[PDB]
Nucleic acid binder design. Structure first.
Ligand SMILES: [Mg+2]
Ligand SMILES: [Mg+2]
Ligand SMILES: [Mg+2]
Ligand SMILES: [Mg+2]
Ligand SMILES: [Mg+2]
Ligand SMILES: [Mg+2]
Ligand SMILES: [Mg+2]
Ligand SMILES: [Mg+2]
Ligand SMILES: [Mg+2]
Ligand SMILES: [Mg+2]
Ligand SMILES: [Mg+2]
Ligand SMILES: [Mg+2]
Ligand SMILES: [Mg+2]
Ligand SMILES: [Mg+2]
Ligand SMILES: [Mg+2]
Ligand SMILES: [Mg+2]
Ligand SMILES: [Mg+2]
Ligand SMILES: [Mg+2]
Ligand SMILES: [Mg+2]
Ligand SMILES: [Mg+2]
Ligand SMILES: [Mg+2]
Ligand SMILES: [Mg+2]
Ligand SMILES: [Mg+2]
Ligand SMILES: [Mg+2]
Ligand SMILES: [Mg+2]
Ligand SMILES: [Mg+2]
Ligand SMILES: [Mg+2]
Ligand SMILES: [Mg+2]
Lengths: 117, 305, 99, 116, 287, 62, 97
RNA sequence: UAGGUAGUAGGUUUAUUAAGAGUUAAACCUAGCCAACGAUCCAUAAUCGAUAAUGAAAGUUAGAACGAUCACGUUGACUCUGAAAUAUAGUCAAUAUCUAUAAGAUACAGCAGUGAGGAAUAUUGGACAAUGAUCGAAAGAUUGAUCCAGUUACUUAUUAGGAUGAUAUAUAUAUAUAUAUAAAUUGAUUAAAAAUAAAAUCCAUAAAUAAUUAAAAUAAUGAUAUUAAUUACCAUAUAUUUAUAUGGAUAUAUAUAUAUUUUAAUAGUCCUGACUAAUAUUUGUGCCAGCAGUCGCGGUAACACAAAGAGGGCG
């Protein structure tokens, strides 16, 4: 109870809210600019200095940040059906409806997230 | 140094001296009898000042310090009496100047030992009615009414609430004769609220005191540099006192479920942000502790929260 | 709402026989009244003095009949001839030794 | 139900007085264990109506505070709801008639609507 | 709760929340509470004794301690006398339903009020409550059944035999008076055992036409034409935090009682030093 | 352990079942224990009226 | 005494053995000090006081030390203002609580 | 426990791996690495929180309960499948019981329960109705997870009755009613009380007895369950929960005039020399018997032992 005052007197914990987009998007321009700007050197430097070598097996730089094209992601995860009009039977129709609903929701969620950030 | 002190009267009374072996009487009991005076065939202690109820708008509160414990008055004439060497009562030889000269404040002081506790005044029914009319028919704001009369806004609202209830009762014919008589007796007991008397009017600038104000601060400003209430509020990081007084004086997506003929209840879905909605995991079980939380239902049932 | 008795099971007794799980020996606690069986609920059955499991089963089969789903004795789950998953290894070995 | 990720009710509160915690969880993890994401609550005991209210003809309500957008997202990524949860969602108006099983399948009195 | 036992003894001059005759006498003959010639602890103990006897004698000590709030409340007038902060020690109990009912004078005592609400007579915002530990919010009405209020504030309804005996004496006195008037309607109680209508028929004085002294409406739970309680005056202290209407017996709880520059709204029969000592005690649980 | 035995009368042999608690007999040195008296072969102290639970004594029951 | 109820500043004073520490107090917060200090405050009109005695707690020396601290360790705001040549406002008073 | 370390510290390569690395295996070099800011070695211990305790707080304590993490499922090693296992699987060995006596089977740290150990910790319960889980296309099957009840003052909470109440007779539009005889418990003879305490009196309410009807769950399914709750002779029909009018229920006088189930109350335990709240006193013992957290008390006047009276806490 004593340590709950750090977290606004909240006894018990929730699980961490799980990011819908798990990397920065392409539309987040400022982040991209920050990433691509010249990395500093000297006292508060990041990488390796130009003259200095790096360990044989290891990479010199850090790996590049995979920026999500959101439209591309949507297309891949949630492809619209190519065979557009093939639909008979009740169970099949139900499945199709379910698929459509899932497409709608995940599309909306991603787009909203992109806008929201 | 504390003993067990039997609570005898501070005032003087006729103690026991000797008495017939069988009677087994106590000095406290004797003192109580004396205070009461003689009891009727009916049961009434008539000679006691405080037996009958005042019909004066002047509350008959207790003054044991002033009359020196001698409570007995003659019922018809309200003139004081004592217990003489004989068992019969009679008038006192010396008159009490303390009872004759008494203050305004102490007449509205129910307990002798606590000066701070005073009785609140009673509103006259006509005044209450006028207030009710003002709020409903004339359509005035409660603050204006409060300013006019000298009541507080919550008090005014309470009065209004009570008036409408009284009216409804009258319409239904629930206000019985015995109830009316009781109301009249209560009215007679208490002093009346005068809207003109400035000392009787309620102080309408009472804000409640916050935590930040109580903790004292001091500032060394230059000798000439001015520093008003606003500046003080700014230093403390509050809104000004006047603004708070003024304030005192003065969305979310909800769905409802479809209701089919057979089903017995709706489903109200309110929106809520994730990370703020649920019952938390590993919260403190407070049920076996004495700081356990006990709430109440819509039906007045006691429920563990 | 009362339903009609069908050709295959026109009687209460016939219905009981169909549903099974020892629903026979229950013709005395309620007599052969078609309306009676169907309108009756759980509390009434309990008062009469039937079992909990039997009560549950009958009501379910009544409901199925009302909805015109095929009622039949779907038997309760049975352990294997050898034994329950846990006890098999030993039991099977014992059985082998015997035979 | 099927799946690895599943939207279900985790039980909370005391004996003879349940409240439910709508979560998304792993199928393997326990019923009342800490989940992936709590989406909402659900008290099954309906709000008790007054005698006058009953006479008038006003139905009780079951309160279900719920993150709609999150739930939708979880449905989209393919987290199968439980039998009770899916019914609740259908009642709300997230899920369609498509999810309604044969047992569930009666004139409607009151229609759904969003309010504020 | 803590059982009622010797609440209104005289050898312990404990001033309880009641309108009892013995309680009144105790109040009368106490004077102050003497805190002279005592250690600090002894003073604190004597404060506890007196102050808790009035404020929540039914409450258990541990329970009280749990409910007891350190953070007292007050109001700045922003327009002089010194505010009595520490009279607020038992402000938290006025929030209770039972105490509020007592303050309203819908009960003779706090115990009685408690009993009333257990029996399901009080209401608060319509719904009837059977729970004394219920706490009013500001704006909440509460409403006792008017008969019970009348019983609380009315006289004790006499037994039939007692009433008949009282009547007999009154009749004799009347006869004596008429004899005295002449100079310058009998009843036999042994025969008339328990026939109330017969008694009514027999009796005819100027001040009661038929009804016996104590029974005009025997079915009602109080004295005859309703009159007040035998010592009602010295305890009729009209509170600030409640708005009352005695016709319907409704009452709006409008405020949590609070201390002003002049006064406190916690109605108590004890001076501020006593209340300070009590506060001191209950901060530390008598450490 | 050297255990004290309180009360007027003690029923204790050379083999009796006895329960020990952590008091201290202050005048006797090197004995830092009390036999708790209601339980075991140690019987409750007889004709005890005051402070009965401190010894074994049951309520006399009129 | 500040506002006719408590000391001005948080004083910390040594009288022989006894080390005194007396903090000022917000109004309503009572006397929360050693029994001797409390007794002296009751007589001297101090309503609000926090504090704690370190080292010796010799009753007599507490009584002597605390009155010395009151008379000597305290400086009134007005005196301080006069000495320094500055305004020394009390913010709470200005606010009107 | 003061020196420890020799795959040890680092370099170069090859295998193995999804993948880094003296992680293993192999090969060849350099002489390192850690340490008195505590190495190596030994002992003890599952770890933790927005959990529990305590404090003014910094902190300290617990790690039962709620939750998160680890490890183990009698002991040790290895193997297989697999994304992931030294798997509660299999293999072999170790310990100890079973028969069926066999390149057997079992291992309650799953739920009940038993014996033991111990100061000390529960039912060989009911139900899958709910919430989950596995199988199944479905029908619905299983579920000692779970939900319910049982035992246990271990903890918390709510109730566990209010108002009036110091005598008994007899006599005789007012009202201080007044006399007379009798009685009156333990103390005590006055500030020595016990005692408004009892008993009485007025008023309910619980429980009971009848009637009714939820909710947990609906498509249907209710273990809990003589369910919670409500009404008091039931229903409908007006108004604003109360009030009145109808319909029928009922029973005596002579269809319609007064009624309408019943009804209580019950607390221990510690203490009264000071610290420590407890002044009404008295008896027994006589440095004994005994008391005692601490200082102490008991040698005939014991406020301290053992009791009666009275009192003070908590309940
Ligand atoms: Mg499946
Ligand atoms: Mg003792
Ligand atoms: Mg005892
Ligand atoms: Mg190594
Ligand atoms: Mg090597
Ligand atoms: Mg390598
Ligand atoms: Mg070491
Ligand atoms: Mg261990
Ligand atoms: Mg720790
Ligand atoms: Mg744990
Ligand atoms: Mg630890
Ligand atoms: Mg455990
Ligand atoms: Mg293992
Ligand atoms: Mg192992
Ligand atoms: Mg077991
Ligand atoms: Mg084992
Ligand atoms: Mg044993
Ligand atoms: Mg235990
Ligand atoms: Mg199940
Ligand atoms: Mg089972
Ligand atoms: Mg308790
Ligand atoms: Mg005697
Ligand atoms: Mg009942
Ligand atoms: Mg003392
Ligand atoms: Mg003696
Ligand atoms: Mg002692
Ligand atoms: Mg003694
Ligand atoms: Mg005694």
């Amino acid at each position: 109870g004593k340590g709950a005052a750090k977290y606004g007197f909240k006894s018990g914990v929730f699980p961490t809210t799980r990011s819908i987009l798990k990397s920065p998007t392409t539309k987040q321009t400022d982040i991209i600019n920050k990433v691509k700007s010249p990395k500093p050197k000297g006292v508060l430097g990041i990488g390796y200095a130009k003259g200095v070598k790096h360990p044989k097996g290891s990479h010199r730089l850090s790996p590049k940040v995979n920026f999500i094209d959101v439209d591309n992601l949507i297309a891949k995860t949630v492809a619209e059906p190519q065979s557009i009009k093939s639909s008979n039977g009740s169970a099949q129709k139900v499945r199709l409806q379910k698929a459509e609903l899932r497409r709608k929701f995940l599309i909306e969620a991603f787009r909203k997230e992109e806008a929201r950030l | 140094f504390s003993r067990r002190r039997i609570a005898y009267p501070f005032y003087p009374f006729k103690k026991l001296g000797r008495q017939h072996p069988k009677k087994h009487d106590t000095n406290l009991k004797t003192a109580m009898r004396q205070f009461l005076g003689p009891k009727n065939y009916k049961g009434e202690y008539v000679m006691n000042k405080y037996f009958t109820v005042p019909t004066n708008h002047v509350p008959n509160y207790i003054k044991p310090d002033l009359e020196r414990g001698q409570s007995l008055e003659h019922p018809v004439t309200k003139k004081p009496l004592q217990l003489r060497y004989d068992g019969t009562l009679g008038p006192p030889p010396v008159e009490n100047k303390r009872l004759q000269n008494i203050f305004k404040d102490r007449l509205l002081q129910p307990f002798p030992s606590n000066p701070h506790c005073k009785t609140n005044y009673v509103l006259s029914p006509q005044l209450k009615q006028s207030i009710f009319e003002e709020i409903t028919v004339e359509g005035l704001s409660a603050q204006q009414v409060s300013q006019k009369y000298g009541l507080k806004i919550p008090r005014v609202e309470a009065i209004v609430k009570l008036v409408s209830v009284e009216n409804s009762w009258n319409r239904r014919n629930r206000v019985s004769s015995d109830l009316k008589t009781m109301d009249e007796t209560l009215y007679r007991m208490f002093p009346v609220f005068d809207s003109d008397a400035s000392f009787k009017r309620e102080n309408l600038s009472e804000i409640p005191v916050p935590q930040k104000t109580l903790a004292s601060r001091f500032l060394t400003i230059a000798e000439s540099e001015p520093f008003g209430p606003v500046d003080a509020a700014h230093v403390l990081e509050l809104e000004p006192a006047v603004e708070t007084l003024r304030n005192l004086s003065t969305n979310t997506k909800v769905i409802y479920g479809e209701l089919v003929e057979g089903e017995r209840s709706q489903y109200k879905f309110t929106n809520a942000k994730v990370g703020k909605v649920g019952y938390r995991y590993g919260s403190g079980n407070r049920d076996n502790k004495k700081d356990r939380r006990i709430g109440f239902n819509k039906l007045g049932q006691m429920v563990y929260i | 709402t009362i339903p009609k008795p069908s050709d295959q099971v026109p009687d209460v007794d016939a219905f009981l026989n169909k549903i099974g799980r020892n629903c026979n020996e229950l013709k005395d606690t309620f007599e052969n009244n078609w309306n009676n069986l169907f309108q009756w609920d759980s509390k009434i059955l309990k008062e009469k003095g039937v079992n909990i499991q039997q009560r549950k089963y009958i009501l379910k089969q009544v409901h199925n009949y009302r909805n015109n789903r095929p009622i039949h004795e779907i038997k309760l789950g049975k352990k294997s001839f050898f034994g329950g998953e846990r006890k098999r290894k030993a039991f099977t070995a014992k059985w082998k030794a015997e035979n | 139900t099927c799946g690895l990720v599943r939207i279900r009710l985790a039980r909370f509160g005391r004996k003879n007085s349940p409240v439910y915690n709508i979560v998304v969880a792993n199928s393997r993890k326990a019923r009342d264990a800490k989940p992936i994401e709590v989406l909402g609550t659900y008290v099954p005991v309906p709000s008790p109506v007054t005698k006058r209210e009953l006479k008038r003809g006003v139905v009780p309500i079951k309160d279900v505070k719920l993150d709609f957008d999150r739930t939708k997202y979880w449905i989209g990524v393919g987290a199968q709801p439980s039998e009770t949860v899916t019914k609740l969602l259908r009642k709300a108006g997230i899920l369609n008639d498509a999810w309604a099983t044969s047992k569930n399948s009666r004139k409607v009195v009151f229609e759904r609507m969003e309010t504020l | 709760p803590r059982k009622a036992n010797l609440l209104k003894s005289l050898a312990r001059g404990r001033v309880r929340t009641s309108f009892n005759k013995y309680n009144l006498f105790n109040l009368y003959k106490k004077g102050g509470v003497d805190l002279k010639s005592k250690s600090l602890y002894q003073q604190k103990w004597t404060a506890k004794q007196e102050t808790r006897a009035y404020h929540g004698e039914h409450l258990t000590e541990k329970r009280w301690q749990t409910v007891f709030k350190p953070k007292l409340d007050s109001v700045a007038q922003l327009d002089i006398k010194e505010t009595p902060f520490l009279l607020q020690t038992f402000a938290v109990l006025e929030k209770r339903l039972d105490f509020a009912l007592f303050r309203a004078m819908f009960a003779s005592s706090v115990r009685q009020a408690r009993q009333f609400i257990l029996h399901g007579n009080v209401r608060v915002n319509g719904v009837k409550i059977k729970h004394p530990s219920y706490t009013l919010k500001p704006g909440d009405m509460f409403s006792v059944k008017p008969d019970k209020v009348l019983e609380a504030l009315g006289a004790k309804k006499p037994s039939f035999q007692e009433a008949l005996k009282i009547d007999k004496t009154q009749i004799v006195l009347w006869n004596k008076y008429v004899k005295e008037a002449k100079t310058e309607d009998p009843i036999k109680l042994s025969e008339l055992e328990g026939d109330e209508p017969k008694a009514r028929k027999l009796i005819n004085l100027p001040w009661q036409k038929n009804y016996v002294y104590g029974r005009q409406d025997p079915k009602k739970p109080f004295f005859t034409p309703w009159k007040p309680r035998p010592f009602l005056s010295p305890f009729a202290i009209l509170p600030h935090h409640l708005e009352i209407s005695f016709k319907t017996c409704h009452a709006v709880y409008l405020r949590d009682p609070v201390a002003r520059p002049g006064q406190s709204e916690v109605i108590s029969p004890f001076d501020v030093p006593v209340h300070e000592r009590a506060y001191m005690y209950y901060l530390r649980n008598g450490k | 352990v050297s255990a004290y035995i309180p009360g007027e009368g003690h029923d204790a042999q050379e083999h009796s079942i006895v329960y020990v608690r952590g008091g201290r007999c202050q005048d006797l040195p090197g004995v830092k224990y009390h036999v708790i008296r209601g339980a075991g072969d140690l019987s409750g102290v007889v004709n005890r009226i005051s402070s009965r639970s401190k010894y074994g004594a049951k309520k006399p029951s009129k | 005494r500040y506002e006719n109820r408590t000391i001005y500043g948080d004083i910390d004073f040594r009288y022989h053995g006894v080390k005194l520490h007396l903090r000022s107090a917000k109004p309503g917060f009572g006397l929360r000090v050693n029994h001797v200090i409390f007794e002296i405050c009751e007589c001297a009109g101090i309503k609000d006081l926090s504090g704690k005695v370190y080292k010796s707690r010799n009753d007599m020396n507490i009584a002597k030390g605390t009155i010395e601290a009151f008379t000597k360790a305290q400086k009134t705001l007005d005196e301080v203002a006069l000495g320094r040549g500055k305004k020394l406002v009390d913010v709470r008073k200005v606010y009107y609580s």
